[PDB]
Amino acid sequence: SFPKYKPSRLATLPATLDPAEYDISPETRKAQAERLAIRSRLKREYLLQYNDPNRLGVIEDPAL
Amino acid sequence: MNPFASLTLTTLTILTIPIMMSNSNIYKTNLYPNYVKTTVSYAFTLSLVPLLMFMHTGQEMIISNWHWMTLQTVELSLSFKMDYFSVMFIPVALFVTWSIMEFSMWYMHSDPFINRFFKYLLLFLITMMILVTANNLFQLFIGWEGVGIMSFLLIGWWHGRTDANTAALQAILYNRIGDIGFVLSMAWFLTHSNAWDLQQIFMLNNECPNMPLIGLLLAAAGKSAQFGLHPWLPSAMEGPTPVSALLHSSTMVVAGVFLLIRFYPLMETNKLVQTMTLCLGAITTLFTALCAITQNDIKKIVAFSTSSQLGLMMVTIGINQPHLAFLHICMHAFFKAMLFMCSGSIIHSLNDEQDIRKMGGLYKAMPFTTTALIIGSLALTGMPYLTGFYSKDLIIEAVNMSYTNAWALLMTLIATSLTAAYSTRIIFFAFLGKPRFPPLVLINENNPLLINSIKRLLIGSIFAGFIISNNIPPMTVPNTTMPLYMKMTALIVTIMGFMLALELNNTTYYLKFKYPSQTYKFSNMLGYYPSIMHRLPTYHNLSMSQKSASSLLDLIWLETILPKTTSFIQMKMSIMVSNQKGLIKLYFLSFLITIMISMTLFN
Amino acid sequence: HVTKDMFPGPYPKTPEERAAAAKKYNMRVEDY
Amino acid sequence: AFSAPAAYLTHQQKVLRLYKRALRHLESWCVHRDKYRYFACLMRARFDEHKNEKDMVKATQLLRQAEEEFWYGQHPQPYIFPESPGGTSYERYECYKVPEWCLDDWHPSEKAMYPDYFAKREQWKRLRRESWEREVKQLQEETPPGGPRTEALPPARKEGDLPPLWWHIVTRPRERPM
Amino acid sequence: SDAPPLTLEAIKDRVLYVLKLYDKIDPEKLSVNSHFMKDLGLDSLDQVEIIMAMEDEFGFEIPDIDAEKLMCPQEIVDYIADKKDVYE
Amino acid sequence: MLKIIIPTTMLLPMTWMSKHNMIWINATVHSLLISLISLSLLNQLGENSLNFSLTFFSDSLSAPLLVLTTWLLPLMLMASQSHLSKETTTRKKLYITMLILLQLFLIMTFTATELILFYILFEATLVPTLIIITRWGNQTERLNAGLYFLFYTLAGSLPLLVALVYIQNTTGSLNFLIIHYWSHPLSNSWSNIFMWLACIMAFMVKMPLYGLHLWLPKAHVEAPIAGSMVLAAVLLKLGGYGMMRITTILNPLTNYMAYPFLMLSMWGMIMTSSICLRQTDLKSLIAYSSVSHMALVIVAIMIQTPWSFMGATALMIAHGLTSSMLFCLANTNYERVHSRTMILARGLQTLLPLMATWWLVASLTNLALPPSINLIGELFIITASFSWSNITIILMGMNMMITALYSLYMLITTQRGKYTHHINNIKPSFTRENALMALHILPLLLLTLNPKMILGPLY
Amino acid sequence: SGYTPDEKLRLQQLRELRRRWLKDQELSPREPVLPPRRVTYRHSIFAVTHVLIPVWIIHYYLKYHVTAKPYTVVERKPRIFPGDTILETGEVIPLMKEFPDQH
Ligand SMILES: CCCCCCCCCCCCCCCCCC(=O)OC[C@H](COP(=O)([O-])OCC(O)COP(=O)([O-])OC[C@@H](COC(=O)CCCCCCCCCCCCCCCCC)OC(=O)CCCCCCCCCCCCCCCCC)OC(=O)CCCCCCCCCCCCCCCCC
Ligand SMILES: CCCCCCCCCCCCCCCCC[C@@H](O)O[C@H](CO[C@H](O)CCCCCCCCCCCCCCC)COP(=O)(O)OCC[N+](C)(C)C
């Protein structure tokens, strides 16, 4: 037994000590797949807009 | 006639010529660093003469050459004070800067912007000279802000590194917290004594009240990195090693102690401020020594050593011995600059490695570096008849025999023991064990620049303490008779610290492993002070800056009160008035009503 | 070059509105 | 940094990462080499005793108290390599990395010096100009409908083809540009 | 700095030097193209130990996502060269 | 004075009959020439004033503001030369005409020996500014900003007209000399309280005071560059100049009528300094900094001590120059970036070193670094407020620390760090922008040598 | 685990291109071209244009301008002990009263 790490607002819980990713269900895997999918879609769009030799400006960011 | 004034102004003037030449052609070549180094050396050898004349006669002088502006009954002029403190601190600072520049000519050979680095170093030196020689509070403030700005510019030398910018902003923040008290003192002095000049301030204040002295103490605490505002000095190591060796080791960080020394005629007249500064010095020296005990980055250890020495001279100020504090400033400059130069040599030789876990056997691999570091550590710990002895031994003796707080006594004794302990830690972990660096051995010190720069400070840290101690007139009452057990307390406590640290460090060879205790975690994490104080206040303040000040008040309620309410009311009234169906039946009914109202009301 | 729909909108009680907003901010509906 | 990540980490990857972190922090605790080797072998022994466990519920039950024990004895000041994201020289040279496209804004007098370099630069620019037109079509025809599922890019398949989106990976400034 | 410009052959020599001192594998059998899991029968933990050994020896640390997929000395050499921008 | 007013008027026919490709050259040259002529006014005497005629007089308070006003116009032309490249000749000539009219109105305002003429020109300065903001503005919010700027000013300044005509009816003259010589105490009555409020609110709204500053961020953000500099440099000083001119008849009522405004300013300086820390925009950050500095000036004027007035004048001039420089730098960044967001472009010091130097110098001057006149005015006001009450030092020190924090935050976010990867149109800085920054900064470091020229009549 | 064949091929091609680009960064002997155009001794001249001239200028400024105004340069009066002689007057300060001297 070891003393427990109690998280706070300015010291969050570490990912390793977090219990959400140890109780794994197929829907959690599906959710991670969708997250990676949308992230990769955004990354592909940015990279397509980024390596274009014809572009001579600033890539407008809708998020910003 | 009387070359004192001429030479004491000429040194500060000749320090400025390369700044003027920075727009010339020599700035674009590789001759600039050597040019700046030679200029600094010439300035030092020229300023050495007023020191001799002061030693021979006791010359003191103030020069008020340029009259800046007159505000009714107040006169502000460019006044330089050339008393004992200034005439003694000019050569020490110039000597240390010369050695540091010669060292930097080797340490920073690969930096493309080396010329800019040397120009920044010279600008800092000029500003510190202005601060030291200042005679009125405005010029002192000019130097006070200039050194801080130069420290900000030199800490964040590498713009890409985020930690460098963070450390620079942190240093500026703490220095502004100190400047609050500095400005308080300036305003009080002008509004009560009707002068920012030191002479009138000294004369008109026979019994100085608490407010200006508390302001001065706050400024000194801010710039000398005392316990309340300490972390900026250890965090300021993100800059290049020469910067931390010159600025944040021996010259810039002694500005607060020098300010307290300059106002010593007012310090003696007050008893509460002396107690407060003694307590501050004691707590800060103990805290930084305790933190340095278990540190693992070499530059961090030496920075905490610098903070401990700063606290020790604050304690010296507390027991009303300002001249002893000035002497300790002079000695600490030498040997702490030595230690940082040796640390930089090790870091460069080990391919930019700073953790002492990866330094092994360097006693034989780097003989000159280890001998210089050993001499510097022995001087720092207070070995008799060395540079650090002539200051620290007298500090401890005077502290032991004064009607002072007892807790400060105990804290100072434990602090010097811990000083010996962490010096032992540095030596043992960086020069004794088996090598632990990567296999590609690149050890090399055979460069004349590094060797000469180290050896000059070596001769200094060996003989300058004796020379200065025996070559100045007495200014303090000697402690001739003392108990033998109390006469040796410094040596006994230093030897006890040596033995305890060595015995505890030798136990790391044993093949046993144990999780750390709470005390080790407290000491390694810097008392948890940098964590909490850099997450609880800041966040909250920033939170308010977006919640209350910006959105809720400015963008919501201030808009709702004056403009939005007016807009809504006028819109409603316009809708009410203009909504007429166009029927003349209602129009003429209203006409009849108003005719009746005017007939019966206005008569 | 940004349409009106892309811009931030008032909090929506309805699930359909919530879904539209989650898609706008480029994140999963149940992650919003 | 080079390899694209997966949507999740398998149990094997978690175990390997925990092993690496534990060994690193043990080395940080045990300064000397012989002590480090002894205790690293002891840790490997205590690490492989549950290597052959079959059920996943108990294995996931483990590697939790292991993480708690690691967090309790993690040496709050670990050793970090100077170029690591926590090192003393992490982003030291990031202020010297000037982008390649800046060279397009140089004055002709400045371009008079280094003529061969700029000739090779024009050759590289032409190569990129053709390769981009080929790559956009290759990536369009290779991606599955509905958008990519992982951020892994395919190599070049034809003879004269070049890998898609290569210009800004090939033309990185340097590790130490100055 | 005075750091010599380490080259590809130097990197390969250092890699083989580190590997040949790993007594779990015989120096004679190993080659620059030899595998780890199959050609030498090494455990996953063993491969992690080799990666950490090269980490310590070369002075720079490899991210886990890139370290867990290095299985031959040749690709380790290639990864180090790509990290350190080696021409030849 | 007519040797100054007449050439400014002749600038209009000079501009309108110039060739299509030479308007900027002529306007800049003759504006600079006019500034040289205005330099003669600076030699004030310790006695009353330079009473030129029955209509215009010059003091040592009006001289620095007049010189700054005449000096600003060439800088405005050089700043506007950039974004007006694709504009027709008639519209460019109209823009220069608006700038010239603004300068002429300000010049006639600052002397204005009679208070009604001062008020007439003080409101006349509002039309060209509104036209500039609402016509040559980029964003779609320029219309709302123009409406706010018009109405906030006019609502405050309308009771001032009634107060002035009432004073003329009772006192019998509004000439400032007669007003100063024949001044009599104001009794403590409700009517006198409302006269005080009417005479003060018109200038406090324009300064602006905290709580009535909502128009300033909008007007500064949506305006073009020249409108931004003329708002931050000269148009904010109209309120303070009027207040220091008109507080001569409000004694001794002010002794207790200054409490609400003193508290509002001494708390709003802290509030706006804190607001500057959490800002996603550059021009908004600079506008809030201007609000903080003007709140400090309000405190100084309301204290009503000689050191307060000297510090107020010094801070007025210094803040004008510094804010104009900061707006110039922000505009140069926005022209290349086309976004106007602080964190969108980063690490520009690696790409534009000299502009990084200009940024550093402007931030240091804004940071109130000694011995610049910024700190001279700051420190004078601090000492005067300390004499007023020993507890003000807490608020002033907090303001100083927050000012340093947000200034260095502005410098670090835009200059230090790693450059943004997806921006490849950061062309090398032109000679025009470097010359603009140099002409902004050199007068500050030159005035730090002769502070008595900007310390006002109570020197 | 390990590299997929597509990953191996892509990394190989990227490495080839990167090495080509890096090799292209080298400078030839004539690559740097500069167009030329013009319009004890070292220390001896250095001490003259950097030390002597500032001394001359500052000494002139202090002697004939700063000291012209009153009270600009004020020197602490030298310490006077028993037994010294004053240059201006010539008088001799009386000695001490012969305190008892043992050890
Ligand atoms: C008139 C008579 C004169 C004679 C006087 C007496 C003569 C000598 C007597 C000896 C006295 C102590 C000497 C041993 C020092 C301790 C060394 C030790 O055992 O460390 C191992 C041990 C844990 O080490 P570890 O975790 O196994 O290390 C992991 C590896 O070794 C990792 O190792 P590493 O390689 O990473 O680094 C190792 C490093 C790391 O070591 C550490 O962890 C640092 C912690 C030790 C510093 C403590 C020394 C002084 C403490 C001052 C405290 C000031 C007041 C603070 C109040 C806090 C209140 C909460 O240690 C060192 O390098 C050397 C340690 C320093 C020894 C040299 C200087 C000590 C001598 C000076 C002290 C006394 C002589 C005064 C002379 C003047 C005459 C009066 O330390 C302790 O157990 C702590 C012992 C003392 C702590 C006292 C605080 C307890 C507070 C509890 C709560 C109380 C109630 C509060 C209520 C508040 C209500 C508001
Ligand atoms: C070695 C010398 C060093 C110092 C040099 C100082 C030079 C100063 C030059 C700058 C002067 C600033 C302008 C001053 C204008 C204010 C004074 C002006 O209004 O006076 C007018 C007179 O102004 C002059 O006549 C004309 C001066 C204008 C030109 C100044 C010199 C520089 C001009 C540069 C213009 C461009 C040069 C060419 C470029 C291609 C009217 O005087 P008036 O009210 O009747 O006087 C009554 C009293 N009296 C009877 C005793 C005379």
Ligand SMILES: CCCCCCCCCCCCCCCCC[C@@H](O)O[C@H](CO[C@H](O)CCCCCCCCCCCCCCC)COP(=O)(O)OCC[N+](C)(C)C
């Ligand atoms: C919102 C952003 C800022 C806008 C501007 C803010 C500044 C406006 C505030 C006005 C300043 C003070 C107004 C009155 C000051 C006189 C002192 C008086 O208030 O105190 C007591 C007065 O008692 C009561 O206050 C009577 C007045 C109560 C009614 C006034 C409204 C109070 C709340 C309204 C706040 C709304 C402000 C914003 C309006 C849009 C003292 O009683 P007494 O000694 O016998 O009378 C003194 C006057 N004598 C001597 C001439 C006779």
Ligand SMILES: CCCCCCCC/C=C\CCCCCCCC(=O)O[C@H](COC(=O)CCCCCCC/C=C/CCCCCCCC)COP(=O)(O)OCCN
């Ligand atoms: C950004 C928006 C700011 C809005 C500012 C509006 C408020 C300005 C202050 C009040 C303005 C009206 C004052 C009247 C002008 C002064 C004239 C004067 O002084 O004459 C007085 C007359 O005094 C008055 O008539 C005042 C009546 C006020 C009526 C209008 C009320 C407007 C709102 C009042 C509260 C506002 C105060 C705080 C405003 C804060 C800003 C929102 C003397 O009367 P006699 O006839 O000579 O008597 C002598 C014989 N015993």
Ligand SMILES: CCCCCCCCCCCC(=O)SCCNC(=O)CCNC(=O)[C@H](O)C(C)(C)COP(=O)(O)O
């Ligand atoms: C100072 C800090 C101290 C920290 C102490 C940390 C705690 C130490 C004790 C840890 C306890 C455990 O082992 S937790 C045990 C976790 N569960 C398992 O290991 C089950 C099956 N393991 C696998 O399959 C792996 O892949 C494996 C076979 C290991 C490798 O495979 P490779 O063939 O691909 O190398």
